[PDB]
Amino acid sequence: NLYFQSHMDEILARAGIFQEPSAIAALLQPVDFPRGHTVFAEGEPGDRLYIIISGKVKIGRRNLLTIMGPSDMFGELSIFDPGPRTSSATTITEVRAVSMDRDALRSWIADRPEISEQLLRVLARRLRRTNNNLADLIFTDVPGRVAKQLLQLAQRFGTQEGGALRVTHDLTQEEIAQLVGASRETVNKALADFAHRGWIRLEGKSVLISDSERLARRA
């Protein structure tokens, strides 16, 4: 949007930290990570929140909890509740990010208290989503969870093509079973069954979802 003075501002605008836009351009210092870079590891002191400008970061534990992309914030939980990193954050593509420490965020919030309401909103949403993932681990079979994960990654990283619907997740198969919490083998067969069925085509780092309806039904 040539409405914002920077792509940075557009994505930060989409992250929620604003709510304009010559004023927005009072913004922070970027950082570029290579692919495969562990931005921080689980259990480390956490003094820093990041917001992704471009690229994807996986969040993992010991299970992958989520794949984040442009405008997604990570590293906030140890800023809001001081203590060790709850998970590792590793880049699965090259990533440009902006970051800020607890002092900087507090001055950001003092300056615009409204930002706190947007941060609560994002947290509440993460809670909602995580609740659903847990309820899936309890109430849904493996291929049902595979189907859920494909349609989740779609809603965030999906591009209409035809359509439908290309989802370029940038994940290996290991990485997709880790999102679903099942064996690579159990997830391998669910994806082959869906591909056989005609509902998806499977092309390395992206799935062409041709039949979103029946995928959704399989949940």
Q: Please state, in angstroms and rounded to a whole number, the distance separating the CA atoms of residues 196 and 190.
A: 10
Going residue by residue from 23 to 62, which x/- string records binding to ligand CMP, judged by CB under 6 A?
A: -----------------------x------------x---
Instruction: Out of 55, 76, 89, 152, point to the residue binding a second copy (CB under 8 A).
Output: 76
Q: State which residue, 133 or 212, has the beta carbon closest to a second copy.
A: 133
Query: Within 133-172, which residues bind ligand CMP (CB under 6 A)?
Result: none
C-alpha dihedral sign at 108, 19, 80, 179:
negative
Q: Tell whether residue 195 is a contact of ligand CMP (CB under 6 A).
A: no
Question: Cβ atoms within 10 A of the Cβ of 12, count?
Answer: 21
Instruction: Out of 116, 155, 159, 172, point to the residue binding a second copy (CB under 8 A).
Output: 116
Residues facing 175 on adjacent strands? none
Radius of gyration of the chain (CA): 18
**Three-state SS across 22-56?**
CCCCCCCEEEEECCCCEEECCCCECCEEEEEEECC
Q: State which residue, 31 or 124, has the beta carbon closest to a second copy.
A: 124
CB of 116 to a second copy, least distance (A): 4
Going residue by residue from 83 to 102, which x/- string records binding to ligand CMP, judged by CB under 6 A?
A: --xxx-x-------------
Yes or no: say if 150 and 113 are a contact pair by the CB < 8 Å rule.
no
Three-state SS at 59? strand
Instruction: Out of 130, 132, 155, 172, point to the residue binding ligand CMP (CB under 6 A).
Output: 130
C-alpha dihedral sign at 170, 172, 178, 180:
positive
Yes or no: say if 212 and 154 are a contact pair by the CB < 8 Å rule.
yes
Judged by the rule CB under 6 A, the positions of this chain that interact with ligand CMP are 46, 59, 65-66, 74-78, 85-87, 89, 126-127, 130-131
Which residues bind to a second copy, rule: CB under 8 A? 61-63, 65, 76-77, 80-81, 86-87, 106, 109-110, 113, 116-117, 119-121, 123-128, 130-131, 133-135, 137-139, 181
- The annotated binding site for 3',5'-cyclic AMP is made up of 63-66, 75-78, 85-86, 130-131, 138-139, 174-184
